[PDB]
Amino acid sequence: PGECSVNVIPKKNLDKAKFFSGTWYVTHYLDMDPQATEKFCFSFAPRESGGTVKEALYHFNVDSKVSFYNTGTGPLESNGAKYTAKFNTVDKKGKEIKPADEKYSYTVTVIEAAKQSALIHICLQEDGKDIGDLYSVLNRNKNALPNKKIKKALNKVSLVLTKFVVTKDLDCKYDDKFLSSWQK
Ligand code: HEM
Numbered sequence: 001p002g003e004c005s006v007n008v009i010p011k012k013n014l015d016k017a018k019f020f021s022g023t024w025y026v027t028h029y030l031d032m033d034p035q036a037t038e039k040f041c042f043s044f045a046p047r048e049s050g051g052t053v054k055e056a057l058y059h060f061n062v063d064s065k066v067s068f069y070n071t072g073t074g075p076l077e078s079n080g081a082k083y084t085a086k087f088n089t090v091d092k093k094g095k096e097i098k099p100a101d102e103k104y105s106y107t108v109t110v111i112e113a114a115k116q117s118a119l120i121h122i123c124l125q126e127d128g129k130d131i132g133d134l135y136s137v138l139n140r141n142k143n144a145l146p147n148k149k150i151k152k153a154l155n156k157v158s159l160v161l162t163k164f165v166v167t168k169d170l171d172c173k174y175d176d177k178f179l180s181s182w183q184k
Pocket residue numbers: 026028029031036038039040041042044057059070087088089106108122134136
């Protein structure tokens with residue numbers, strides 16, 4: 001049904017300080033539900049300390065011209081490249097406008113990271129049950145193409161980059177200040 005992908009392997013020895021810093025843009029995404037066809041842009045600022053991830057998330061619905069802001073918090077797994085977060089909703093000023101709903105969570109796996117690129121996978125859940133998943137290619141630069149290591153990781157799990165939505169070809173609007181000021 002809304003089952004999350006299997007064979008999502010956490011990167012071995014992810015450099016935490018490097019990955020959990022700055023702002024990441026999704027340059028390419030693949031929603032595993034083929035009927036999910038609203039076009040989006042996304043960026044986020046993940047941070048980690050003492051085995052807990054605290055990240056700020058930014059989505060922009062290109063179809064509707066509406067953005068939404070969330071923050072997520074959760075424990076990093078012992079592998080160091082996978083975490084499950086509970087999330088709330090905040091405004092552009094970072095003030096909570098909707099509390100976290102305990103029944104919802106998401107699990108991020110960092111599959112690969114190389115140079116200025118990364119590949120992540122996100123499984124959304126409700127009551128610990130899968131409700132949908134998506135792969136995202138990340139880059140520090142909105143307009144950049146992914147490192148070959150990222151394509152190799154995609155190919156290991158039988159995905160090809162051409163199937164992904166390219167965000168640079170979308171009319172994205174980003175709130176970069178929300179992310180750059182994260183935890184300042
Ligand atoms: C370009 C890449 C992405 C796309 C296309 C995408 C797509 C979506 C869509 C369509 C929804 C539902 C929106 C709605 O209900 O109106 C959603 C919700 C959500 N996404 Fe993503 N997503 C992306 C990246 C991410 C990433 C990387 C994360 C986590 C690090 C994430 C976390 C969430 C969360 C927590 C929600 C639920 C928000 C809420 O209901 O308050 N998304 N996403």
